[PDB]
Every structure is written in structure tokens, then in C-alpha cells.
Amino acid sequence: KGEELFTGVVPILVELDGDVNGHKFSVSGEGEGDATYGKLTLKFICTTGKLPVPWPTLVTTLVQCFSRYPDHMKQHDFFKSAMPEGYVQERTISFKDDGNYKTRAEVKFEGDTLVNRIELKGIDFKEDGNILGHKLEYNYNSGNVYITADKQKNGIKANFKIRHNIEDGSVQLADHYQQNTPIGDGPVLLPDNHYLSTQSALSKDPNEKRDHMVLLEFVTAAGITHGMDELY
Ligand SMILES: [Mg+2]
């Protein structure tokens, strides 16, 4: 099954093409994931020049198959179950009092590398709002991603809120609506309601002159009832 592909360190490639309000840009990322520890280490580079939106607003778009699912809830890991053929991941990201991103990605193996290929379209952003005015801090909050089954499309949906810190002490909300559907025809795991608990750390490469983001993340699945407390 697909979970077998994730028992070790897996190389990752991420490629994004974006248009936000007519600002065209591309990001390329490289690194690896080790789902055993729910761990991602990636460096992203804007290959077209300066990124026209803040790096933190792209973190959710830029591989949920690297979540650590505890053994007792392994039967709820849709993401690995769709591999290697992969899945389509679509989102609408609604920035409160501002514009929205619509994203379409395909996440799949290309040989033994896990690839996330994404098209991002941003519209109706305010020229000097928090996004296009670059008023968001270079940091990121921990949070939960709530997953539910979508049996009609043999997939999942997710609903969650990202809170981006604004440089003035306030918060820019980014409401996320997500739908994933397998690319292949084999059976997948359709989960009970549960969530992914995330933590993310953003940094810079001291030797890198291009516009870039270094990202370290841990993601753990939770929210499924077990009775293992009785064992002890
Ligand atoms: Mg603050």
C-alpha cells in the first residue's frame, strides 16, 4: 500500500507558477520529508525575482502525505493511500478584507521523488493591503487542519483557518477550503473526522542572495478516539 513508500526519508520537489493581480512569479523548492517523524525540511526559491506576496502566505500551498499518522489511526491516512499515483489538491484561500488565492496541485511520485506541482491564481487583492503591501511578519503560527471524508469524490475535504501575524500586532486571517481527489483508480482510505496539528518555522539561508524561504515543519494527525489508556 502507499504507506510503504513513506517509511524512510523521501526527496521532495515543489514547483509553483503564480499570478496574483497580474504579478507573475514561480517558486521552486527542494528538500525531504520523513513521515515517521512527521518532519519536513525544505528550501524554496523565487526563480523569477522578488516574490510579489509574503512568503508566509504560500506555506499551505507549497504535501500532507508527510503527516505522521499514529499507528492506531493509520486507517485514516488518505494521503499516503493515494500514492504513488497521487492526488489532486484544490483550495480556495480567502484573505479576510482582501483577495483570494485559488490553487490546483498534483501531488505524486516521479520515480522515488514526491512532487508537488501547483498553479496559483490570486485575484481582488488590495494594492496596499497586508498581502501586496508586504505587512506580514516572517513567522508562522501553529494550528489544526480539520479533515473530513468526501465519499462522492472518493477523497477528502479540509476546512481550517490560518492566522498570519501582521507587523502591527494584529492578525490577517486566511480561511482555507480544500478538496482532494485521487488521480489513480485504486482504492483509497476514507477517513473519519480528524485533524492535523502543525508547527512551522521559517528562516533564511545566510549564503543565499535570492528571495527564498527555509521551512522546517512537524505535522501530526490527531483527533481519533482510541482506547489504549486502558492498557496502562
Ligand atoms: Mg507580534
From Swiss-Prot:
Stated consequence of mutating E217G: Suppresses the 399 nm excitation peak, leaving only the longer wavelength peak at 475 nm
Consequence when changing V63L: In EYFP; leads to yellow fluorescence, folds faster and more efficiently at 37 degrees Celsius and has superior solubility and brightness
Effect of S197F: In H9; increases fluorescence at 395 nm excitation
Post-translational modification: Contains a chromophore consisting of modified amino acid residues. Maturation of the chromophore requires nothing other than molecular oxygen.
UniProt-reported outcome of changing T198Y: Gives rise to yellow-emission variants. In EYFP; leads to yellow fluorescence, folds faster and more efficiently at 37 degrees Celsius and has superior solubility and brightness
Result after altering Y37N: In EBFP1.2; shifts the excitation and emission spectra to shorter wavelengths and increases quantum yields compared to BFP
Keywords in alphabetical order: Chromophore, Luminescence, Photoprotein
Outcome after substituting S142P: Increases fluorescence at warmer temperatures such as 37 degrees Celsius
Pfam families in alphabetical order: GFP
Biotechnology note: Green fluorescent protein has been engineered to produce a vast number of variously colored mutants, fusion proteins, and biosensors. Further generation of mutants led to more stable proteins (at 37 degrees Celsius for example) with brighter fluorescence and longer fluorescence lifetimes.
Effect of Y140C: In mut1.9; shifts fluorescence lifetime from 3.03 to 2.74 ns
Gene Ontology BP annotations: bioluminescence; generation of precursor metabolites and energy
Stated consequence of mutating Y140A: In Cerulean; leads to improved quantum yield, a higher extinction coefficient and is 2.5-fold brighter than ECFP
Outcome of substituting N141I: In ECFP; leads to cyan fluorescence, folds faster and more efficiently at 37 degrees Celsius and has superior solubility and brightness
Effect of I162T: In P11; increases fluorescence at 475 nm excitation and at warmer temperatures such as 37 degrees Celsius. In Esmerald; leads to brighter fluorescence. In VisGreen; leads to brighter fluorescence
Domain of life: Eukaryota
Effect of Q64M: In Citrinine; leads to excitation and emission peaks of 516 and 529 nm, respectively
Mutation effect (Q64L): In RSGFP4; increases fluorescence and shifts the major exitation peak to 489-490 nm
Resulting phenotype, A201V: In EBFP1.2; shifts the excitation and emission spectra to shorter wavelengths and increases quantum yields compared to BFP
Distribution of this protein across tissues and organs: Photocytes.
InterPro entries per the UniProt record, alphabetical: GFP, GFP-related, Green_fluorescent_prot
Effect of I123V: In EBFP2.0; shifts the excitation and emission spectra to shorter wavelengths and increases quantum yields compared to BFP
Function: Energy-transfer acceptor. Its role is to transduce the blue chemiluminescence of the protein aequorin into green fluorescent light by energy transfer. Fluoresces in vivo upon receiving energy from the Ca(2+)-activated photoprotein aequorin.
Subunit structure, as described in the record: Monomer.
Record family assignment: Belongs to the GFP family.
Designated name of the protein: Green fluorescent protein
